[PDB]
Point group: C4
Chain length 387, copies 4
């Protein structure tokens, strides 16, 4: 049975810890893949952590990783939420150096982009098999969300970019049923920049909070209808949520354009809350360290600086990294709304630390009808490793 | 289908070995989590061992564990009874430094308490997902059973404390259906102290045998009805079952108040047997070593010293530790009563032994219509380890 | 659904290799339990290898095993046929230093004997739980088959001994349904000796070929009806099948009494084939090395020396050990008879080899309508190990 | 339910990466079997990689493998596509130094050939059990496909050879239902040579593209009808696809006979595409290195040199090896034709590299309605290993 993820996202006052895998701690001894982007998506029966591996283990010469991000070895794999990315519980998903995954209520759909920078191919899998392909359309690192795509009544939705890391690139929305591409749309966005979208369902539409890597320290926002009509803009709020970013007090916010004089970026997320917004960010303005979630009053629909809530989940003494959204299915929350949840990647090793290698672990959090006390559930491994 | 655990507990003459995981022996070489509290609970299809991990493995620098009990790394995980707490068979349960788990006949319910000492949050999971929360009510180490909670006709019951390790604290009963809190009750108990309750179903009510950490060397006893009305007191018998404790001959027992001049404690358990009681205890009065189960005649309802049976399960040459109750579902015993069972934790390493680290393994036992011969099924690893 | 294992055993001309686990080879590096008795039994869906472990791994100080056979650590565990006894695929079965397992078509029944030599307890499990117990009846190492018990139309049958390794002991048949003992019988056998029976179903009765450890170099034979009436005797054939044993040419065979002046023994097996018999034995008369199966014409019902077939499965250059029978369910062979199969244990390490430790691997074989060529599928590890 | 694999093979313009296991990279640290022939076959629910192991692990003295190819230790095992051949996810299949596997829509059928060169036995398994046998018919290394056999409406088909590696040998087709041999056929082919067939279903018949090890640098082709009538010949195209082979420009092709003056060979594959053909080959004419797939116009039915497409999947800087065909079931592609896919083995170690040992990893590819960009998804481990 296909999920209906037509409900409204749950209004929430805070976020409860769901899971912590401690994979780097464990991989000091265990057989743990060197990973990045430990992203989460859920079927009606369970939530899984997806991740990329270069086929190498923690504490093994292969972890060296002077090896290109976008290598022939990179694969998308998965375990159940909270499990470490260890070899012996891992399900193979796709050959991939860029991915999105999601479940329609019957099977898992995954997309992995691999191949040469100049003409990379995205292969869509459905039920553990290749079902369809998308080649590069602009021949400049075809890439995607690195988080959960979004299925609504059996049709699955995601966003890709193809174009420079910096200047103007091109962006498309893609639609699928049973792993077969049934629609696509180019996103009109001159002057604007979209990458690594963090999306979730809300009211029968798909909303995303993305990364502008060109000039924006505000994050773009998309609202994709089933048809493929969309509105695009920036997250209204008068508080910047990218990294790097300038001061809050030195920023005015905008619903239609990038505002800060920054290049670069980090994947992060945000959740509409009626007219309000919950926005994730690194506590640091410059580094991918510390992690905090703020609720801004009227932050989705206007240039608000009104902070309604703050919750620290990784303190500014500790490394953090990428973050993304997912939702709990109603068939698992048992609610009549979609519980917003997100994960946070906590990166260890190069470049910030002396090690030959680089991996991440995760902390996962869900919505909840209550104010949750500050804490830091940080990675915790003890570096450097044996090697 | 929800379990009916409305039956009477089985009358039993002794206890048969169910399982022994040998996890510390195995983890000399295998990839075995450093654990504590290897507690057992059963669905209608299987019995699982729950445990806490700090995300570290036996024989790995991370086992060091000069690391706070109540750390950001601590998670509740599970394997099938008798399996070691090894990485590759472990199911993630909750982020937690205090837990209870139980199954209602449809899904597993777990509660893990994590967060700061001053305002910790307990997250209830149901079906492998966050479904509800309880924040600290007194801002002093919100904590729970460290054994199996108790489901009766689909509503699940457990006991928490919030307050000093020593002096008067506060204690609540909590009720849930499908992971949603449906009731709660404060337990009136001045002069008395409740922690780490060991509970089981008996006659459509929940009975617990708990730990008084303030002044009692007798263990408290609760009887919780479906409503949340309860009687509370102390286990009547004229024999002390806590550790530390004084001599049997130097104690008179009481159904209503703590009796010995001891602080401190250990989790342990007891089973009503009509008017009789089976009581667990460490053979040592001072140390958590050796383990024995005694049957006292009239021990539940009066100040009896009448020992009906004794069974040694760990000899006084060997380390023991925490212990708790669970019951076998009728759907697995095939009886028309609830088979009482318990587990015993056998702690190795610091402080009793020279090692950088501390873990435990378990022995599990069930009820049975026969007198079972004395033995010691003790942990068995050979310390110190490589390190 | 309960199996009907009422059919006749299949007439067979030879035996095809089913499985080889290579667990000692693998455990040079992998995490492989030190095991003994890698015995096989089958449900209607799969065949599993059961084994005992002392909770220690190959290549780990714990493998030392100057440790008593009959220790507190010894547990019965299982994997799917052909898998190594590795930690991460192992299902826990029972606490045990002596076992039998079998499936009735609905659940697995296991029996593990543990406890003190003087009053050991056998715990019967059903569906992964304690369901019943048998204490020592003669207070001298209560013990059992170390191979597959036998279920016929939902009632399960096995044989135990209690008494000296040497002189007269006592022997019982035990009957069970859903893990509850429903019948028992003492076996009248003065002058005779029964241990380690290898049994299988044939024509709605249970037949076993056992080990006489007192004076017999012929193996005893039992035929147990559903009631518990039985005939007992020795395997008629004029060829000795125990180890140690004298020459074939120096033996006359007997259907009613032990014949050779040998103490000691080895578990082995035999299959009725109408009036014929297939008999297993070590190629060596003195050592547990080499393994061969012979078909004797009229060997079940008379003192025959007529060898109809011989098949070597381990050559006399290689260590062998225990062996036992099982049958393929009709629901898996797809035949209208019960395919006879057996396994052979191949023991490495002490005492025959310089190592601190002792383990075994297995080769498994099934019936088949054809003459199978001689070979040696022997253990294969390269000793001594790192240590 | 039995599969209908009666459909036409899908017409395809290129091949998308399905899976990459990185098992040699991983086995630098993980517990990875030393393998060969990582072949793929699919049930209606999943695709599995089959492989042979000698029971030894990467990085362990046992990997030495001065050990005969055709040893007593060699077993056929399997994992899910894309998983490494690691110990803890492996399903045991057969005792085997030569194999074929396939699923009929209800159970897995496997065949493993083991035993002495002079009289080897092939045991057919069905549902994880021995169901039937084939002994050597010519007493010269009875052997088979080393890739997916082929089930059509519940009857399963495969090809074996028995005879010299070089001169004339003998070749048979074998047919089975539920693991029982229901038909066989000798293949008339004087002057010709068949080994290691790569087969797939097309139009209710079985087509194979095989290895001539005697004199042919073209690959033989068989078309087996349900009856067991067949046409046999050589792949028509005017381009040689074996290794070793001469230049393309120095070859004329033939539909009926071997053409090049080469002995030796490599397993490879080809797919009919109406009248066209997709042909696999090593980029090297002399070495098993690099891998490319070419589409020849009219290549199946005539002596064409017309190259319609080329796709590189392993570049000529990298080791490659064996290759085979499988098809995606309609129940997983969701198409009304059979998606052609193939795998490529990438061999590391001896003899090409300085190591004591030899293993392989794989890349898997499927059909697809699009031109796929050149790349090299090559093995990637860093040799030599610790040892
Ligand atoms: C660990 C790497 C994370 C990672 C980062 C990151 O920002 O750190 O950048 C992505 C970008 O290159 C930019 O978004 C610029 O376009 C990149 N995607 C790929 C596949 O290139 C991804 O791998
Ligand atoms: C290995 C530790 C076991 C352990 C012990 C124990 O008595 O040894 O004490 C619990 C208490 O602190 C006391 O009951 C006093 O309140 C503690 N709970 C937490 C989470 O603090 C638990 O971790
Ligand atoms: C590796 C040991 C195998 C093993 C042997 C064996 O003959 O080698 O002997 C069994 C006997 O003692 C005898 O049959 C004499 O009664 C023993 N059973 C137990 C549990 O004592 C069993 O463990
Ligand atoms: C890694 C070995 C691969 C391998 C090769 C190969 O060509 O490399 O040759 C097969 C042949 O011997 C020939 O086809 C000649 O008949 C062989 N089959 C067996 C079992 O002998 C198989 O093992
Ligand atoms: C960190 C590390 O091991 N670097 C090695 C380096 O020694 C070598 O010279 C070069 C090419 O092999 O780059 C590699 O990454
Ligand atoms: C037992 C052990 O390794 N202790 C280390 C110690 O060397 C160090 O000085 C301190 C802080 O890192 O405490 C740590 O736990
Ligand atoms: C083989 C081996 O390690 N033996 C040790 C030995 O050194 C020790 O003196 C004794 C008691 O610990 O027996 C042990 O088994
Ligand atoms: C590469 C290797 O380890 N070779 C060993 C060699 O030392 C030994 O002399 C011989 C027999 O054991 O062949 C073995 O394969
Ligand atoms: Ca930016
Ligand atoms: Ca106390
Ligand atoms: Ca004897
Ligand atoms: Ca050739």
């Amino acid at each position: 049975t296909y999920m209906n993820n037509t409900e409204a996202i749950c209004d929430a006052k805070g976020f409860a810890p769901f899971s912590k895998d401690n994979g780097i701690r464990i991989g000091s001894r265990g057989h743990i893949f060197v990973i990045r982007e430990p992203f989460v998506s859920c079927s009606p029966i369970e939530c899984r952590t997806f991740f990329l591996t270069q086929g190498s283990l923690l504490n093994d010469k292969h972890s060296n990783g002077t090896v290109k991000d976008r290598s022939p070895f990179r694969t998308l794999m998965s375990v159940e939420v909270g499990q470490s990315p260890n070899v012996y519980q891992a399900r193979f998903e796709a050959v991939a150096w860029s991915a999105t995954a999601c479940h329609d209520g019957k099977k898992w759909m995954t997309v992995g982009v691999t191949g040469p920078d100049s003409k990379a191919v995205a292969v869509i899998h459905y039920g553990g098999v290749p079902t369809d392909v998308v080649n590069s359309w602009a021949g400049d690192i075809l890439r995607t969300q690195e988080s959960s795509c979004t299925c609504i009544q059996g049709d699955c939705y995601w966003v890709m970019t193809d174009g420079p890391a910096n200047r103007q690139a091109q962006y498309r929305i893609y639609k699928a049923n049973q792993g077969r591409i049934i629609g696509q749309t180019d996103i009109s966005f001159n002057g604007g920049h979209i990458e690594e979208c963090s999306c979730y369902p809300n009211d029968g539409k798909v909303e995303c909070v993305c990364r502008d890597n060109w000039t924006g320290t505000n994050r773009p926002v998309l609202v994709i209808s089933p048809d493929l009509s969309y509105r695009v803009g920036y997250l209204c709020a008068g508080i910047p949520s990218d990294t790097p970013r300038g001061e809050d007090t030195q920023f005015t916010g905008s619903c239609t354009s990038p505002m800060g004089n920054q290049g670069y970026g980090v994947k992060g997320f945000g959740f509409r809350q009626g007219t309000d917004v919950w926005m994730g960010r690194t506590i640091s303005r410059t580094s991918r360290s510390g992690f905090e979630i703020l609720r801004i009053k009227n932050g989705w629909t206007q240039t608000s600086k009104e902070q309604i809530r703050k919750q620290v989940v990784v303190d500014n003494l500790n490394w953090s990294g990428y973050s993304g959204s997912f939702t709990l299915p109603v068939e698992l929350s048992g609610k009549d709304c979609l519980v917003p949840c997100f994960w946070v990647e906590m990166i260890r090793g190069k470049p910030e630390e002396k090690t030959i290698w680089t991996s991440s672990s995760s902390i996962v959090m869900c919505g909840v009808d209550y104010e949750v006390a500050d804490w830091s559930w940080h990675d915790g491994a003890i570096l450097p490793f044996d090697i």
